[PDB]
Amino acid sequence: EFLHAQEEVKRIQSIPLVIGQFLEAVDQNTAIVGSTTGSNYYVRILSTIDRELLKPNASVALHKHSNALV
Amino acid sequence: AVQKVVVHPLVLLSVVDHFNRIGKVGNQKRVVGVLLGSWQKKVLDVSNSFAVPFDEDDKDDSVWFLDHDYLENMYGMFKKVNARERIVGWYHTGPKLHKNDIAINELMKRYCPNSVLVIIDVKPKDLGLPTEAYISVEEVHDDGTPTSKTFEHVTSEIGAEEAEEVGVEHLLRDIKDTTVGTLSQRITNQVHGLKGLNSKLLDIRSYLEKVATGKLPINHQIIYQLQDVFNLLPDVSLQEFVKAFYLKTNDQMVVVYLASLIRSVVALHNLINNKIANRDAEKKEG
Amino acid sequence: TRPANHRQLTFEEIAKSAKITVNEVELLVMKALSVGLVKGSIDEVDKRVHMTWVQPRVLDLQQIKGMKDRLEFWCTDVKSMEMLVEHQAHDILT
Amino acid sequence: AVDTAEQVYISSLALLKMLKHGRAGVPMEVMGLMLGEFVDDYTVRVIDVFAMPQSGTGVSVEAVDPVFQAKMLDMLKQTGRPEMVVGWYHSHPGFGCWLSGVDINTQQSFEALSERAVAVVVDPIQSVKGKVVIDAFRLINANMMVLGHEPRQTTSNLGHLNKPSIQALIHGLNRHYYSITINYRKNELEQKMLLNLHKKSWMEGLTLQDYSEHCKHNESVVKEMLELAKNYNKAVEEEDKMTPEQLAIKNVGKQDPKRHLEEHVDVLMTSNIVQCLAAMLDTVVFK
Amino acid sequence: KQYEKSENDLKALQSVGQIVGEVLKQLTEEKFIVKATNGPRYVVGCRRQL
Amino acid sequence: MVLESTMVCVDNSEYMRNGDFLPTRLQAQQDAVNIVCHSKTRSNPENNVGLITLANDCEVLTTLTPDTGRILSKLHTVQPKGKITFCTGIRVAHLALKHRQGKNHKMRIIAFVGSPVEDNEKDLVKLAKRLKKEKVNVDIINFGEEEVNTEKLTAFVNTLNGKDGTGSHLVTVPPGPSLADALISSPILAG
Amino acid sequence: HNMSVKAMRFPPKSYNKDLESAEERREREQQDLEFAKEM
Ligand SMILES: [Zn+2]
C-alpha cells in the first residue's frame, strides 16, 4: 500500500513547469530558491530528490502555482 | 517480412464488450471485426477496432457476409476524427480457427496489403499470452494442391503506451507483484519459466499422437527441426565445462562474499545509531 | 548412425567404410565442409575428426519411436527440477 | 428533486476511450459524446463513448455537428444494440476540472432535451496511476440563486464525501453546478484478461546475461565501491561531534557513503544470485 | 454576400493569441525547455505531430 | 409504404457471354435491373437495391445500398466468367436478407439464371422446405438459355409457395433473342 | 545481519504522536482558502 502512494506523489511534476535556482536550505527538507521571475521564495521540496545532487548553483524546477521544489 | 505485432489493451477490451452485446444470441456467433492501426519501422501496431455485422448458417458454411457499407462509412468517420489512424487488417474472436477464415482475409485484402488477422480469447485460462495472430502466405509448392495457402503465426504480445498505463494500472487494483528485487525474477521466470518450457515440451507430444494411428499426413517438413533439437542438445559434462563452471562459481560467489560481509557492518553501525538514542534519552526525558 | 555422445570417427574407419586411401580422405572432407552438408572440425595427428552438425535426413515410423522415448523421460526431468522450485521457494511468494 | 447521492456508474471501456482521445490531441480542448443506458431517478449508467471530430484550429468546444451524430447514432444501431445519448464530455488539458463560461453554454443547450445529461471533465495529464482526473458535474438553476435557496436536499450521507479543490471552487462551483461521486464497474470478464496479459516475461530469466560481461560488470561496481567505503572510512570518524541533526542540514552539498554504500550491495546481490541460480537450472534441464 | 463576409467575423473572433518564445535545449522527446520574450524560463511540452 | 427489401441476384455466369441479344446480354439485363430498381424506389423510397451473384464465388460485388452508382460502375467490364453454382445460391440469397436493417420487411428476391444448372433436385427440396420454415417468397425469372422447359425450377417454386404460400410465380425464358424489356413487363405490372 | 536487526528494534519506543498538521492552523488554512474562493 505504501508503494501505491510512492508513485502517486509525482503527479505534481506533470507538464507546466517553471524554472528557478537553488540558493540554500534552512534545514532538512525545506529550502530557499530564486525564481526566474526575479523574486525569491521560501519553498518546500519533493522527497524523492537526492539532496546530494544540489548546489553548485543548481537550476531547479518549480510548481507554477504552489511554487515548491519539483 | 513482419517482425512482431503490438496490441494495446484498448482493442483487447474493445472486443469483449462486443462479445457481451452479442452474447444474447446464445446458440452461436463469432465476433468478427475490422482491425485499425498503423505499422511503422517494420513493427505491426494495433490501436483501434470495431465489429461488423456477421452471421453464419451451419449447413454449407461457405456463405459469409461483410456489410461493406458499414465498413466504408465508419472507417470514413474514423479517418475523419483521426487521420493518423488507418486500417491494419482484421480480427475474429477465434475459439478454434473457424473455416471461413481462409477467405475472409482474401475478401478484404483490397484495403490492407498485409491484411493480418488476430485471434483473441473470450474465456481466459492458460499459462501464457492468449492473443494469437497469423500471416497470409501462399505457395505453388511441394505436395498438397496446385493452389496452396496456409497461415503462419507471427509472434504476438501486448504492447504498452504511456497514456494507457495510467488507465491500465488504475483498473487493476487487485494484485501487482512489483518491487523487483531478488525474487521478481524467481517467479516471473524461474517458477513460471520452467513451467513455461512444460507446455513447449508437451506441444510436440501432441504432434507425436500420430505414431501409427493419428492423422494421415505424416511429416515431411516437420522433422528436420526435431532432428536438430536432439542434435543441438547441449554439451555434456566431461570437458572443462566442468572446470570452467567451478571457475566462475569461485568468482561470482567472491563478490557475494564481499557484499554480504559489507551488509553486516552497515547494520552494525545502525545499531550504534539506536543506542545513541536510547541511553542518551532516558536520563534527559525520563 | 553414431550417437551424440562421441560421433568422432577416424580416418582409418573411412578407409575401411569407403575403401579409399589415406592421402585422399582429407580432400574428401574439405569438399564436404565446403558444400555444407556437414559441419565439424578436422584433426590430423590423432587421425580423428570431430563431426558436430550433419545434414537432416528423412525417416520412417520406426525412428519416431526413438524420438518418442528419448523425449519421454526428458518430460519428467522438467517436472523433477521444478519440483524443487515451488517447494523450496514456496514461502518467498504465495 | 435530487437526493445528492446520484452515483454515476460508468464503465471499463469508456475511460480508455476518454484518455486516448484526450491525450492524442492534447492542447486543444477536445470533446465527444456519451452513449449510455439511462436508468432510474437516482443513478445513471454510461457504457459507451464515441469521439466527435473537431471544427478548426483553436481551443474551443465549438458546436456539435448533427450531421455527424445522426449518422453515427444509426451506424452501430444496425450492427450492435441500441443505446441513447446520456451526456457529453470535454477535456481540460492541464487545468483540473471545472465548467468554464464557454463550457456551461454548450451544456445548457444539452439539458433542454433531457434534464439529466451529464457534463464530464477528464484531464489526461494530472493522472498517473491511482488518479484518472475526473468529477463530472451538472448545472444548477440560477433562478434558485436569486431566491437564496440551497438545492439538492441532502437525504443521505453519501454526497459530502469528496472535498472540492479550491481552484474549482474559484469557478462556478458551488454557485452554478455541483459535483457527483462516481465509482467504476469492474467485472471478472475484463479483470483477469488484462492482469495476466500486461507484463509477462517470456524466457528472459532462462538466459545467462552476456556471460563475459556479467563478471566484468561485477568489477565495474566493486572498484568505486572501495572508495565509497573510504568515505565510509571517513564520515563515521567525524562523529561524536556537532549533534547529528546538524549532520542532516550540512550534508546536502556532497554525497554520503552510508546510503550510497547499502545501495550497491542490493545491486551486487540480485545481479549475482539471479544469474548464478539460472546457470544451475540449465545444467539439469538441458541434459 | 453582405451576410457572408459578416459571418466570417462571427467565428474569426474566437482565435487566441500565442506567446512567442524561444527554444533553449531539449531534455527528452517530450520535455522541452523555453524562455519567452517576457521573462522567465519554462519547461514545456509539444504536440505529437509537430 | 409497404415494407419490403428488393434484392436482385445478377447473373455473371459464363453462358451469358455471347452476342445473341441485341446490345449485349449484360447491358440488356442491366437496364432491366435499372428500370425495376427505379420501379421499387419510386413506389417506396425505403427500398434499397444492391446486387449479389450466384456464381462459383458468391461475391458481394456492390453492397446493399440505396445508391446505384456503384451498381452502374461495377457492371461495366464486370467479367461474367464463372461456373454457375446455384446450390449455394439460395444460402447467399437468404442469409443476405437476414443481415438487413429490418426483418419486418417483406423478404422478396428476384433471381436471374441464364446457364445450365447441375443441382440435385433432392438438395433444393431440402432447401425448399428450409424456406418453408423461413417464410420466404422469391419470384425467379429465367433469362438467357437453359434446359428448355426449365428443369428443377418448376418443382422448386411449387415447393416454395407450398403450405398456403400460393403467391409466387416462375417466369420462364423464351428461347429467342428478342428485346427483353417486354419479357419482364409482367412482373412490373403485377406480382 | 538478522541479529543486528533482531537486537535493534527495541529502542523504538515513545514515538508519542504523529501530528497531521494542526487543529488551529488547519482551521486557519481553511479560512484562508475561503477568502481566496470569495476573491
Ligand atoms: Zn472546458
Swiss-Prot record, chain A:
Indicate the quaternary assembly: Component of the 19S proteasome regulatory particle complex. The 26S proteasome consists of a 20S core particle (CP) and two 19S regulatory subunits (RP). The regulatory particle is made of a lid composed of 9 subunits, a base containing 6 ATPases including PSMC4 and few additional components. Interacts with NR1I3. Interacts with PAAF1. Interacts with TRIM5. Interacts with ZFAND1.
Record the organism.
Homo sapiens
Q: What is this protein called?
A: 26S proteasome regulatory subunit 6B
State which residue ranges cross the membrane. Answer: none
Task: Report which part of the complete sequence is shown.
Answer: 71 to 140 of 418
Q: Which family does it belong to?
A: Belongs to the AAA ATPase family.
Tell me the domain of life. Answer: Eukaryota
What does the protein in this record do?
Answer: Component of the 26S proteasome, a multiprotein complex involved in the ATP-dependent degradation of ubiquitinated proteins. This complex plays a key role in the maintenance of protein homeostasis by removing misfolded or damaged proteins, which could impair cellular functions, and by removing proteins whose functions are no longer required. Therefore, the proteasome participates in numerous cellular processes, including cell cycle progression, apoptosis, or DNA damage repair.
Q: What is the annotated localization of this protein?
A: Cytoplasm; Nucleus
UniProtKB/Swiss-Prot annotation, chain B:
Residues recorded with modification N6-acetyllysine: K200, K210
State the source organism's domain of life.
Eukaryota
Q: Which GO terms describe its cellular component?
A: cytosol; extracellular exosome; extracellular region; ficolin-1-rich granule lumen; membrane; nucleoplasm; nucleus; proteasome complex
> Which keywords appear in this protein's UniProt record, sorted alphabetically?
Acetylation, Isopeptide bond, Proteasome, Ubl conjugation
Pfam families on file: JAB, MitMem_reg
Using the record, list the residue span of the signal peptide; answer none if the entry has no such feature. none
Q: Indicate the family of this protein.
A: Belongs to the peptidase M67A family.
Its UniProt miscellaneous note says: Does not bind a metal ion.
- Record protein name field: 26S proteasome non-ATPase regulatory subunit 7
Identify the gene encoding this protein.
Answer: PSMD7
UniProtKB/Swiss-Prot annotation, chain D:
- GO molecular function terms listed in the Swiss-Prot or TrEMBL record: endopeptidase activator activity; K63-linked deubiquitinase activity; metal ion binding; metal-dependent deubiquitinase activity; metallopeptidase activity; proteasome binding
Expressed, tissue-wise, as follows: Widely expressed. Highest levels in heart and skeletal muscle.
Residues the record lists as binding Zn(2+): H90, H92, D103
Q: Name one GO cellular component term.
A: cytosolic proteasome complex
Keywords, A to Z, come to: DNA damage, DNA repair, Hydrolase, Metal-binding, Metalloprotease, Phosphoprotein, Protease, Proteasome, Ubl conjugation pathway, Zinc
Q: Which CDD domains match?
A: MPN_RPN11_CSN5
User: What SUPFAM superfamilies does the annotation carry?
Assistant: JAB1/MPN domain
The protein's Enzyme Commission number: 3.4.19.-
One biological process GO term for this chain?
regulation of proteasomal protein catabolic process
Q: Enzyme class, one word? A: hydrolase
Q: What does this protein do?
A: Component of the 26S proteasome, a multiprotein complex involved in the ATP-dependent degradation of ubiquitinated proteins. This complex plays a key role in the maintenance of protein homeostasis by removing misfolded or damaged proteins, which could impair cellular functions, and by removing proteins whose functions are no longer required. Therefore, the proteasome participates in numerous cellular processes, including cell cycle progression, apoptosis, or DNA damage repair.
- Record-stated family: Belongs to the peptidase M67A family. PSMD14 subfamily.
User: Could you tell me what this protein is called?
Assistant: 26S proteasome non-ATPase regulatory subunit 14
- What organism does the UniProt record list as the source? Homo sapiens (Human)
Curated annotation (Swiss-Prot), chain F:
Q: Where on this protein does the Glycyl lysine isopeptide (Lys-Gly) (interchain with G-Cter in SUMO2) crosslink form? A: K122
CC annotations in GO = cytosol; nucleoplasm; nucleus; proteasome accessory complex; proteasome complex; proteasome regulatory particle, base subcomplex
Q: Which UniProt keywords apply?
A: Isopeptide bond, Phosphoprotein, Proteasome, Repeat, Ubl conjugation
For this chain, one GO molecular function annotation is: identical protein binding
List, in alphabetical order, the GO biological process terms annotated in this UniProt record. Answer: proteasome-mediated ubiquitin-dependent protein catabolic process
Q: Which residues cross the membrane?
A: none
Keyword check for Ubl conjugation: yes
Coiled-coil blocks: none
Record domain VWFA: where: 5-188
Oligomeric state and partners? Component of the 19S proteasome regulatory particle complex. The 26S proteasome consists of a 20S core particle (CP) and two 19S regulatory subunits (RP). The regulatory particle is made of a lid composed of 9 subunits, a base containing 6 ATPases and few additional components including PSMD4. Interacts with NUB1. Interacts with SQSTM1. Interacts with UBQLN4. Interacts with UBE3A. Interacts with UBQLN1 (via ubiquitin-like domain). Interacts with DDI2.
Role summary: Component of the 26S proteasome, a multiprotein complex involved in the ATP-dependent degradation of ubiquitinated proteins. This complex plays a key role in the maintenance of protein homeostasis by removing misfolded or damaged proteins, which could impair cellular functions, and by removing proteins whose functions are no longer required. Therefore, the proteasome participates in numerous cellular processes, including cell cycle progression, apoptosis, or DNA damage repair.
User: Which gene specifies this protein's sequence?
Assistant: PSMD4
